[PDB]
Design a protein that fits this description.
2 copies of one chain form a homodimer. By secondary structure, the first copy, chain A, is mainly α. Chain A has a single domain, classed as Orthogonal Bundle (di-copper center containing domain from catechol oxidase). Chain A is built from 10 helices and 11 strands. In chain A, the strands form 5 sheets. Chain A has a 3-stranded parallel sheet with strand order 2-1-11. Chain A is globular. Chain A starts with 9 loop residues before the first helix and ends with a strand. The relative contact order of chain A is 0.19. Bound molecules: a molecule of 3 linked components (NAG-NAG-BMA), a molecule of 2 linked components (NAG-NAG), 2-acetamido-2-deoxy-beta-D-glucopyranose (6 copies), alpha-D-mannopyranose (MAN) (3 copies) and copper (II) ion (4 copies). A molecule of 2 linked components (NAG-NAG) binds next to helix 3 of chain A. It is classed as oxidoreductase. Keywords: catechol oxidase, polyphenol oxidase, coupled binuclear copper enzyme, type 3 copper center, oxidoreductase. The assembly is dimeric. Crystal structure of Aspergillus oryzae catechol oxidase in met/deoxy-form. Chains A, B: catechol oxidase.
Amino acid sequence: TLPTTASSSTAVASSQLDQLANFAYNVTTDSVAGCTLQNLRVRRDWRAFSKTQKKDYINSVLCLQKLPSRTPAHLAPGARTRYDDFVATHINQTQIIHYTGTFLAWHRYFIYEFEQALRDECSYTGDYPYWNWGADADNMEKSQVFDGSETSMSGNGEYIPNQGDIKLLLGNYPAIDLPPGSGGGCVTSGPFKDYKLNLGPAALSLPGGNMTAAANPLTYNPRCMKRSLTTEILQRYNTFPKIVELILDSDDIWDFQMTMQGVPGSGSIGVHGGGHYSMGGDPGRDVYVSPGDTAFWLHHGMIDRVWWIWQNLDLRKRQNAISGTGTFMNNPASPNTTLDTVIDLGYANGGPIAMRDLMSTTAGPFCYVYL
Amino acid sequence: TLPTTASSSTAVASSQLDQLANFAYNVTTDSVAGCTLQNLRVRRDWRAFSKTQKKDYINSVLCLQKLPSRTPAHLAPGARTRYDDFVATHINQTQIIHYTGTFLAWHRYFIYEFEQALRDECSYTGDYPYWNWGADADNMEKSQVFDGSETSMSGNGEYIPNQGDIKLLLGNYPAIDLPPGSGGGCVTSGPFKDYKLNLGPAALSLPGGNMTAAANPLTYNPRCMKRSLTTEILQRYNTFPKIVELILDSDDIWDFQMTMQGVPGSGSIGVHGGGHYSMGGDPGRDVYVSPGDTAFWLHHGMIDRVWWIWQNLDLRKRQNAISGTGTFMNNPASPNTTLDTVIDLGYANGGPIAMRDLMSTTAGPFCYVYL
Ligand SMILES: *[C@@H]1O[C@H](CO)[C@@H](O[C@@H]2O[C@H](CO)[C@@H](O[C@@H]3O[C@H](CO)[C@@H](O)[C@H](O)[C@@H]3O)[C@H](O)[C@H]2NC(C)=O)[C@H](O)[C@H]1NC(C)=O
Ligand SMILES: *[C@@H]1O[C@H](CO)[C@@H](O[C@@H]2O[C@H](CO)[C@@H](O)[C@H](O)[C@H]2NC(C)=O)[C@H](O)[C@H]1NC(C)=O
Ligand SMILES: *[C@@H]1O[C@H](CO)[C@@H](O)[C@H](O)[C@H]1NC(C)=O
Ligand SMILES: *[C@@H]1O[C@H](CO)[C@@H](O)[C@H](O)[C@H]1NC(C)=O
Ligand SMILES: *[C@@H]1O[C@H](CO)[C@@H](O)[C@H](O)[C@H]1NC(C)=O
Ligand SMILES: *[C@@H]1O[C@H](CO)[C@@H](O)[C@H](O)[C@H]1NC(C)=O
Ligand SMILES: *[C@@H]1O[C@H](CO)[C@@H](O)[C@H](O)[C@H]1NC(C)=O
Ligand SMILES: *[C@@H]1O[C@H](CO)[C@@H](O)[C@H](O)[C@H]1NC(C)=O
Ligand SMILES: *[C@H]1O[C@H](CO)[C@@H](O)[C@H](O)[C@@H]1O
Ligand SMILES: *[C@H]1O[C@H](CO)[C@@H](O)[C@H](O)[C@@H]1O
Ligand SMILES: *[C@H]1O[C@H](CO)[C@@H](O)[C@H](O)[C@@H]1O
Ligand SMILES: [Cu+2]
Ligand SMILES: [Cu+2]
Ligand SMILES: [Cu+2]
Ligand SMILES: [Cu+2]
């Protein structure tokens, strides 16, 4: 018998999440037969990767950051690498892939196709990782994703003292205040210390309230990845209670995707905004360029997982459920998203595909599950 | 001794507006003391144009609808005419020119560059016209702008019976319901009966609440202009009392521009939305494609006039006043507009220009006044 209310105890909620996740795993694996149980892939918590497993994933990402970019130079002058190709299409489409009916599915297809690049162009044969925020909400610096060792996605940014607070503005609502974290400078430890962020900033929120924005964020702007790990943000938005809340208290797709992303004006940024802004720095604090932070892919692995859990809890009603339009917060107004709506990743990978073919992890081009 | 509170009598409010406009005229001509009294242009009510002067203007617009487009085909494949060049750039920039700090200035520059094309490519030597909404709020079908004669911008459209209401949505707020007008179909008469609208639809609101959106609204879609004149929209949002309230109750530029465009959630679409949607039809009900309705230019003449009046009531504080950001309703968040923000019209006409050179009708490229 599944839980129905999220516990306020962290240990309790974590066990509730396991139960629901196991429920969804059972639902997926039982119904599967192109995708079969025999060729079904499994995505796992970063913490369950062995040291060699972690290093194989990291090395494949590094490979992508070394290979020439496919995007025609005249459409994205700043692109240099295959990794940049994914950042550039995200930047290019930010205003029709967040707070839209396509947000969840687009990102599902996005990370799938990023995974395909690792496998087909960088000889990656491991499992797709996800970052379970709940386990790190008490100390982000100790997260295996961000501890700075050679099995992490590099570490914190170097310490910059006396940083003012972050002030997140959307529309005309009052700013959401956030502390600035423990870093702020370049990330100079771990396997990405030599990584060059090449695109943006498009809309970079800064300590103190300012926002930096390039004239054209697709032009060349080589610089260091910065971070300022902010545990306090995870403590507010990404604890195991908040994760289970999101799954159990959302009765339709609208409430789920909006609770996940944060209801504008509500004071909360959800698990999705909480994971992003907990990284801090650059592009961590830039909704357009966020894939430029290597932890993006683990973050959205967990996003896709929580959606997949929520879907499988009431499959018949939820698998193909869509709500919202084709424009950011429906500004300007645009038609409702439908199963016939087509999305694409530009020159990053793959091709145009209908929403219809993205709603199940065991259908269309998808054949995977979460453990 | 100027009015300070708007009157509810349409007769008194009309005289109040006349006093405020006459004050603004005095202020501007006094300021003019390369803009001089000897070269200052006067923009005038369409109702003040003689029959010959009206036909002179219409014929120049028709000339622009026959001259070949400048836009590179690969950027706007549906463009055919110089008129299309203006429609195309508006479509392309709609999301950064409405509910932005640049809204008022951008449209001032837009209609001036349209005037440039009339004067330099179609031999126009007359005055720029404006549509005084308040004088037609009692019956739009008798408006000299919309009466369907050879001195109108064409008139009403073919009858469509038993139409549903227009339902205007923005972000989350409940719909503003508008009646669907006394027409519906292609214009039946007047100078633009055979005029072909080539771009869009991009986001065309329809009777009953649906919206039509082309996959790419910059590709070729030749069709008639449709109209459904809606006097009740003018009665609700564009009477002389509503015009005077906008001017006299707005104590800063944020409030002025937002009251003009309609505050989301307020139930009102302001004089700006009222003028647009009162035309009904296609592209009248399409925020991206609206310059495709030939009355657009007279509508935005009045918009600019009302801004000019408001500026001249306190020039020291209002001449150069700006508020807002570079994105529609600041979704997603973007930096504040400043006097150094640059706007441009693509290939429609002219070069890039900074906000600081747009704030006065008697500075920068501008040397005109309203009577
Ligand atoms: C709609 O708005 C977009 C964004 O402002 C406009 O995009 C701009 O288009 C031009 C022309 O394609 C791009 O520029 C230059 O062309 C030369 C080759 O002649 C190339 O070598 C340069 O690198 C550059 O691409 C420009 O970069 C591009 N800007 C952005 C931000 O993408 C578009 O032209 C507008 N469409 C219409 C119909 O006005
Ligand atoms: C950003 O998105 C736009 C729209 O999807 C892309 O524009 C297409 O670009 C190709 C190649 O220049 C054109 O043939 C199409 O006509 C364009 N479509 C539209 C609707 O304009 C653009 O290429 C994307 N840029 C990147 C870097 O992905
Ligand atoms: C999943 O299936 C196993 C049997 O294969 C069962 O023991 C377990 O209780 C199931 N989990 C849930 C949450 O139903
Ligand atoms: C914010 O930007 C302004 C200029 O717009 C600058 O003067 C100020 O120092 C900046 N504030 C911080 C905290 O960096
Ligand atoms: C925009 O201007 C307001 C003042 O009206 C200021 O408080 C805010 O910080 C500015 N926004 C940014 C992103 O700097
Ligand atoms: C405008 O100036 C004229 C001429 O000086 C004057 O007669 C009139 O009263 C003025 N109008 C206003 C509203 O100040
Ligand atoms: C969008 O869907 C809602 C129901 O979720 C519907 O009421 C509305 O009319 C739709 N919008 C359009 C523009 O058709
Ligand atoms: C509105 O759109 C829906 C969805 O396509 C359609 O079923 C309905 O018939 C449309 N109504 C009108 C009046 O066009
Ligand atoms: C367990 O720990 C979480 C943080 O991970 C708290 O938010 C919760 O209230 C409980 O103390
Ligand atoms: C209108 O009223 C004002 C009051 O200040 C006078 O200054 C002016 O002469 C006119 O009578
Ligand atoms: C203003 O408008 C009202 C009706 O809207 C009339 O009663 C008045 O005479 C003036 O035309
Ligand atoms: Cu995204
Ligand atoms: Cu994200
Ligand atoms: Cu406009
Ligand atoms: Cu307008």
